[PDB]
C-alpha cells in the first residue's frame, strides 16, 4: 500500500517471517490488475507452508 517504491536497478527487499497472514484479502478479494503464479497453486496459498 506504499505510495513511493523503488526501481528495477535497486529495489526494496523486505523479509517477512515469524507471523501469520491472510491471503483471502490478497487473492480471493481482488482489486488488482494482474495476479499470476507459477510453481505454487494460487488457490491453495492459504493452505501451503
Amino acid at each position: 500500500n506504499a505510495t513511493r517504491f523503488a526501481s528495477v536497478y535497486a529495489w526494496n527487499r523486505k523479509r517477512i517471517s515469524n507471523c501469520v497472514a491472510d491471503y483471502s484479502v490478497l487473492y480471493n478479494l481482488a482489486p488488482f490488475f494482474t495476479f499470476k503464479c507459477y510453481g505454487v497453486s494460487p488457490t491453495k496459498l492459504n493452505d501451503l507452508c
Binding site: 487473492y27 480471493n28 478479494l29 481482488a30 490488475f33 488457490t43
Partner: protein, 48 residues
C-alpha cells in the same frame, strides 16, 4: 453435441478473466465455476 447451455451474464473487465476452468476469486467462487473437464467457448464483446 447433445445440447448447449448459454449462460448470459454482465461482468466487469477486471473480473472477466476468471471465467475459465480452475479459477478462484470473488466472481469465480461464490457465483459461477467451471470444472476441469468442461468443454466450450467463451465469447466476449465490449458493451460500453
Amino acid at each position: 453435441f447433445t445440447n448447449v447451455y448459454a449462460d448470459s451474464f454482465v461482468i466487469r473487465g477486471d473480473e472477466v478473466r476468471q471465467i475459465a476452468p480452475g479459477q478462484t476469486g470473488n466472481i469465480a467462487d461464490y457465483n459461477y465455476k467451471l470444472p476441469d473437464d468442461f468443454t466450450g467457448c467463451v465469447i466476449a464483446w465490449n458493451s460500453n
